[PDB]
A paper describes a structure:
Prc (also named Tsp) is a member of the family of C-terminal processing proteases (CTPs) which features an embedded regulatory PDZ domain inserted into a serine protease domain. In Escherichia coli, Prc is involved in degrading abnormal proteins that are unfolded or partially folded and marked cotranslationally at the C terminus by an SsrA tag and that are exported to the periplasm through the Sec translocon. By associating with its adaptor protein, NlpI, Prc is also involved in the regulated proteolysis of MepS, a lipid-anchored hydrolase specific for PG cross-links. The activity of Prc strictly requires the PDZ domain, and the PDZ deletion completely abolishes the protease activity.
To assess the structural role of the PDZ domain and the hydrophobic sensor residues, which have been shown to be required for Prc activity, we also determined the crystal structures of Prc-ΔPDZ and Prc-L245A/L340G when both are in complex with NlpI. In both structures, helix h9 and the hinge region are disordered and invisible from the electron density map. Additionally, the entire PDZ domain in the structure of Prc-L245A/L340G is also missing in the electron density map. Nevertheless, the structures of the bowl-like body of Prc-ΔPDZ and Prc-L245A/L340G, including the protease platform, are superimposable with the structure of the resting Prc-S452I/L252Y. The proteolytic active-site residues in Prc-ΔPDZ and Prc-L245A/L340G are also in the misaligned resting-state conformation. Our crystallographic results also reveal that Prc-L245A/L340G, which does not contain the two ligand-sensing residues, has a flexible PDZ domain missing in the electron density map; importantly, the bowl adopts a resting-state structure showing a dislocalized protease platform and deformed active-site loops which are superimposable on the structure of unliganded Prc-S452I/L252Y. Since this mutant contains normal PDZ ligand-binding and catalytic residues but has lost completely the ability to degrade MepS or process FtsI, its structure demonstrates that the two hydrophobic residues are important substrate sensors essential for stabilizing the ligand-bound activated conformation of Prc. In contrast, Prc-ΔPDZ, Prc-L252Y, and Prc-L245A/L340G all failed to process sFtsI. Protein solutions with concentrations ranging from 10 to 20 mg/ml were mixed with equal volumes of reservoir solutions, and for most of the protein samples, crystallization experiments were performed at 22°C; the exception was for the sNlpI–Prc-ΔPDZ complex, which was performed at 16°C. For the sNlpI–Prc-L245A/L340G complex, crystals were grown with solutions containing 0.2 M sodium citrate tribasic dihydrate and 10 to 13% polyethylene glycol (PEG) 3350.
Author numbering:
A (entry chain A): 29 to 284
B (entry chain C): 25 to 232, 343 to 675
C (entry chain B): 28 to 286
D (entry chain D): 25 to 232, 343 to 672
The structure:
């Protein structure tokens, strides 16, 4: 009796939509604008099923039809991040914000990319901006913390403590922060995770997120065995489009 | 044509340059091998470097012109991040004006009488000189410069009437230059100031043969020489061909000549190495993020297995150095010549175009390119080739001296450093031989007249580098140096011809155009290779 | 918890470029009817292998609409009806497999499994005993037969499993799961032999898919639903989508979630 | 027409029948609710059942014809699995020949003088009779049958010349039947022998109304009656309509009449239950694999809440019984009448066609269907409705007798059994009232003349069921029984008319065709409902 979900499976809806999308794209029922939009949408779906190469294909095709979709560059940038090509990922996110400087999630994703790319101060610039846009979103404080931990461990912790104390404390993620701060134990975190999950999909999601941050915590302490297990347990949930799933995979790639 | 400052057009940033600046800054601050922070300390240095680009000789701008803009020197990072280039274009327009002032003053000084009897000197390196305080100080510096330019031409036999014709042409041309400068020239020089502060191989760019074999023979002994010009795609294949052919002859040893061999393909350094050693890693490549890739040759087949010398010089750069370092570290070949260039890094180009530029700003031109460092090379023993290059086992005389060229002299060259050694098996040792090879080498070159003359030229160059930048403005002192230079050369040539049974030259210009200098370093390396051949067959276990 | 765990398997680049290629070819009209039904079959097998069984069923149904006499297709539809708990219709599909081609062996396995989950233990044993005789050194054939016989007579199932092991060449890795079932080795030894035999993440994942399922079933039959539950989820975590053991770990969990 | 045995065509299996047999056997052995093994014991029983389909009366085949094929009776499972139908077609062709022998012998007998002055009897149930050993023995049995058929017609007033005209027509027609039998009739009967051995609702099939309300008024009190014919899709909606209407009329209590209400839609039993209670489960449905589904009405608006009686009889079957059992188990309504049918199972059809049949055998016809049991019903208290049905709280005199109808009498009906009770909250109790309801009921029906007559008919039917199957061949004995039957009926009717102030009938045939029997059970249920209303009010 640890805490495990049934790994998530494609829902019937996601699969009939894909089948429908294939027919529509084969048809001649779409404008160019409508087609680029649908290729985007099918990319988002394939990504959510964990088919990132099929996703990139639909995204590239979208940009070939219209090269000014910021929403598409954002995903290409994500993929370049998972592939370890940080350098090109920066280019993609710059493109997102050049098309639409209000596209906030580009700040998160460029920040993550800069984090994995060993540019911690620059990562902090992006992630602090992502924080200011929604400070009660705990995951924004968590990624900011990950970047600041590499600059100054003790000051990162202090800023994380402040971010928690100023927040409304509502969203579940603050519990991962509480763990990071030393306020609760790992068992209490897990206790609160089960209490907050209502069904298998929410359990899986919570475990994806939580095992990744637990994984990162242990890795930064040097415990590679525990980190390795935790990253795999995050991935086991099959929550394909969570950033935490994507970078659990990347973390495992780097431990190999 | 152009007679006043106010007819120099005032240069203005083009509509795309703000964007291009943001893009360049984005690449350099995020992806460069060197992890610099574009802070206030860095901004100041970009500023200083930009001034030296505008005025290399520190004789155009006033210290007051510089201090005006130096108050905001620490803001240049911000300017660059947000595409505000006011400081760069303001200084460039001020520099154009100040330049026209200097050239027009020079046109006036030219007609005044020339007197080269003074015992004054001219400094060729003013790069750390205080900025001149005023017009009088500028005017004295250009009196000096025009005198240097005049005397320079007098020493090539021209008359006073002809010196004034030439320098009129030259100074008027330098003024026509000013009027033909465009916005992109300014932008370009501003991005160069950013680039070259990071490292000397980084840049902004505005929008727009085979291996030869011979055989040398001393006594009845034979040495095969592979004259490799470059690490071109295909080299490793052409070298197999040549090694089979040398086998059909019976050579005691082989020389690979990588002198003046620069740049090249890294794959070719790896695969060429393969021909002389069994297996293993040749080089470790580190990216901008601490990640280390190890490159190996995985064919297994040694095609040579015999005594081998690698001949290298200060101009041996990049792929060349990898190959020589591998052969050294594996104990496979003796390295002979000079410490190499120390080009330990790799650069890559990136376009600044984006796929949506044409559509959203149709009236923009195409946008150009950046070049930046992304990788550093490390040897199998852990040390980088960056800076130190490869240190030969036998150093020719010109190698035991610090030279003007090489990565260690370039401006802001990244430092040498090291990582862990890779896993590998040495194929030989060769350390025993080193002290007998050196004793025999030193015996032979004490008696060779080319070497004797090289040591003489080195002693004389070394006692002269004190005042290397200080040139005399006395015509007689300078003619006398040119004449002792020509007389030494003539004697050198005639010493050679007497030894060879060739007729003496009467004067230096009677020498054929197509005259080939001898190659003492290659000749002496043949002797070194044969020495190696003996000590290697004389080894029992 | 220091379990043995693999990185859950991901679509390979090859599987995804082939799917992309398949979409284009089907969208062309360059294809005989035979060729098209064959390609739809192949794309279904690929989608099933990626865990997209509704997309698979769709390509399979489309294949039969073009040619209704592909036994290979009915076999998959029968499997899907098994995972859906519609055992009745699954039997129909397998009968159809064997009517088209009575030498299509895997229909005997799958109809066996279906009849097992459908509470027809004697009939299941008939199909699984026939599947056994067609390759007795394949340990998984002895394992599924044992699962069915366990419901008839626990003591005699075990004896027949012991005999099947003793007759065999003992070469294939799965005999180690049998050895566990027989009492000859401990759970820890099984896991030790699993890691020793695995060479890379894909082989580890596969071994864990298989092995966690049979461990799961062992504990379930002992009444330990917590351990069974964990083990089934751990099998599924490997994402070896086309293993029978993956499919029925899912089914077993569905029956624990209903109860 | 046709005069000799050898002009009856010899029937042969069609090319698809082997396959159809394999497909049928596959469905029945694998998917049926009942988990039987098609072994040797089962094969013999299929065999015995097949014989009874060929010769119900055990007067066509010889014991030696039967023993010929009975040697291999235990092999019929194999035959069915592998589509070998030689036994079924061989027996069927032999039976056709033997049948023609019987009919032609019967035609010859008709000419002989008829004498109905014996003390002989005829058995209507020969289904347990030894097979006749030879032609003499067959001939005695058909002497007896033809005498029954003759006397049967004599007792309806026909002349000897007219009896021989009719029976000539009948026996000649039965012979023309033999020649018009086809291969599919044989196959069909063979699959029926398999089917019906599993259970009586399983079959092989060859290829090709609203709610009424009234109000009864006894004394000053009013009772609403919902006459429900069937559990049709839409019923529950039409019943709301009618319940609001009775509310306007201010009724003391309501009767729901589910007599002769059979089959129907299970959803409607669930939703109808909803109108009278608010809880979860109404019924638990079990599949062929121990899996139990619980069906609930989840829109817990009660539209009635007043005293409620459910009136049921032996022909109340399936959906009906679920509704009545829910209302009983929840203590919501009093159930009155007879124990119901006990139809506790559900069947479904399945085509035998496969999508590749037309392509691979274009010459085949379409192939037809099976019907088999897939689900059994359980009540919320755990017990099935299968067999026992619903036992009323007050059983009308007709219910306190064993009947010849109902699932418990059908051949190989699945047994009653039980599962765990579901979670539920009883809405009332009503057991308090039971002993006073029964005392007042028993008082009223001792004095009612319809009930008094039913008691008499029951006593008389009980002393006669002893010999039910044994009919007399004495014309005088049989006329005298027909006349006491007509005279009893006439008196019954006349007793009624004298009480009602209506004219007496002189003879029974002067009775109007459209004459409606009274409904004593409904009348007495109105009284029961009002008793309930009193006792529920205080």
């Amino acid at each position: 009796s640890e805490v495990l979900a049934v790994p998530l499976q494609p829902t019937l809806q996601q699969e009939v939509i894909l089948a429908r999308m294939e027919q529509i794209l084969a048809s001649r029922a779409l404008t160019d604008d409508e087609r680029a939009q649908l290729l985007y949408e099918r990319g988002v779906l394939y990504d959510s099923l964990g088919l990132r190469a099929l996703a990139r294909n639909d995204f590239s095709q979208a940009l070939a039809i219209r090269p000014d979709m910021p929403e598409v560059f954002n995903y290409l940038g994500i993929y370049l991040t998972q592939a370890g090509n940080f350098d090109a990922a920066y280019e993609a996110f710059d493109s997102v914000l050049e098309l639409d400087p209000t596209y906030n999630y580009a700040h998160l994703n460029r920040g993550i990319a800069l984090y994995y790319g060993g540019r911690d101060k620059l990562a902090q610039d992006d992630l602090l901006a992502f924080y200011q846009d929604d400070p009660n979103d705990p995951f924004r404080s968590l990624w900011l913390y990950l970047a600041e931990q590499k600059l100054d461990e003790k000051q990162a912790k202090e800023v994380l403590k402040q971010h928690f104390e100023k927040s409304d404390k509502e969203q579940w993620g603050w519990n991962i922060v509480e763990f990071y701060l030393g306020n609760i134990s790992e068992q209490t975190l897990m206790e609160r995770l089960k209490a907050d999950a209502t069904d298998n999909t929410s359990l899986a999601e919570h475990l994806s997120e939580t095992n990744f941050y637990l994984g990162k915590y242990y890795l930064s302490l040097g415990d590679l065995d525990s980190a390795t297990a935790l990253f795999k347990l995050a991935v086991a949930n099959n929550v394909h489009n969570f950033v935490e799933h994507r970078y659990a995979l990347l973390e495992l790639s780097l431990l190999g | 044509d152009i007679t006043r400052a106010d007819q120099i057009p005032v240069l203005k940033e083009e509509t795309q340059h703000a964007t291009v600046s943001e893009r360049v800054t984005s690449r350099f601050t995020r992806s460069h091998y060197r992890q610099f922070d574009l802070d206030q300390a860095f901004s100041a240095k970009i500023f200083d470097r930009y001034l030296n680009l505008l005025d290399y000789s520190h004789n155009v701008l006033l210290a007051s012109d510089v201090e005006q803009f130096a108050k905001k020197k620490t803001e240049l990072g911000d300017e660059l991040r947000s595409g505000k280039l006011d400081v760069f274009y303001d200084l460039y327009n001020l520099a154009q004006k100040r330049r026209f002032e200097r050239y027009q003053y020079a046109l006036s000084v030219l007609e005044k009488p020339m007197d080269f009897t003074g015992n004054d000197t001219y400094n060729l390196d003013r790069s750390k000189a205080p900025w001149p305080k005023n017009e009088a100080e500028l005017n004295a510096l250009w009196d000096s410069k025009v005198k240097f330019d005049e005397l320079s031409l007098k020493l090539t036999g021209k008359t006073d009437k002809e010196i004034r014709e030439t320098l009129t042409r030259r100074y008027k041309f330098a003024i026509r230059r000013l009027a033909q400068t465009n916005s992109e020239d300014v932008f370009s020089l501003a991005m160069t100031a950013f680039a070259r502060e990071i490292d000397p191989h980084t840049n902004y760019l505005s929008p727009r043969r085979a291996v030869k074999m011979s055989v040398k023979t001393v006594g009845k002994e034979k040495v095969g020489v592979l004259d490799i010009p470059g690490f071109y795609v295909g080299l490793t294949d052409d070298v197999k061909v040549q090694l089979q052919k040398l086998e059909k002859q019976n050579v005691s040893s082989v020389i690979i000549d990588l002198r003046s061999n620069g740049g090249g393909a890294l794959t070719e350094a790896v695969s060429l190495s393969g021909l002389f050693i069994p297996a293993g890693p040749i080089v470790q490549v580190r990216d901008n993020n601490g990640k280390v890739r190890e490159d190996s040759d995985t064919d297994g087949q040694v095609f040579y297995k015999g005594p081998l010398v690698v001949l290298v010089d200060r101009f041996s750069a990049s792929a060349s150095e990898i190959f020589a370092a591998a052969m050294q570290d594996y104990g496979r070949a003796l390295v002979v010549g000079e410490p190499t260039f120390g080009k330990g890094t790799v650069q890559q180009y990136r376009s600044l175009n984006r796929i949506y530029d044409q559509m959203l700003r149709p009236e923009w031109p195409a946008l150009g390119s950046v070049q930046y460092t992304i990788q550093k090379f490390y040897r199998v023993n852990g040390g980088s080739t960056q800076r130190k290059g490869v240190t030969p086992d036998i150093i020719m005389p010109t190698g035991n001296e610090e030279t003007e060229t090489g990565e260690k002299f370039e401006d802001n060259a990244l430092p040498w450093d090291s990582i862990d050694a890779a896993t590998y098996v040495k194929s030989g040792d060769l350390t025993a031989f080193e002290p007998e090879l050196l004793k025999e080498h030193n015996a032979r070159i004490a008696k060779d007249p080319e070497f004797q003359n090289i040591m003489k030229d080195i002693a004389r160059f070394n006692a002269m580098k004190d005042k290397r930048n200080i040139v005399s403005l006395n015509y007689a002192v300078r003619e006398k140096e040119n004449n002792e230079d020509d007389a030494t050369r003539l004697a050198r040539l005639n010493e050679r011809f007497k030894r060879e049974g060739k007729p003496e030259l009467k004067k230096l210009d009677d020498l054929p155009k197509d005259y080939q200098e001898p190659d003492p370093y290659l000749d002496e390396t043949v002797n070194i290779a044969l020495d190696l051949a003996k000590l290697e067959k004389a080894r029992p276990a």
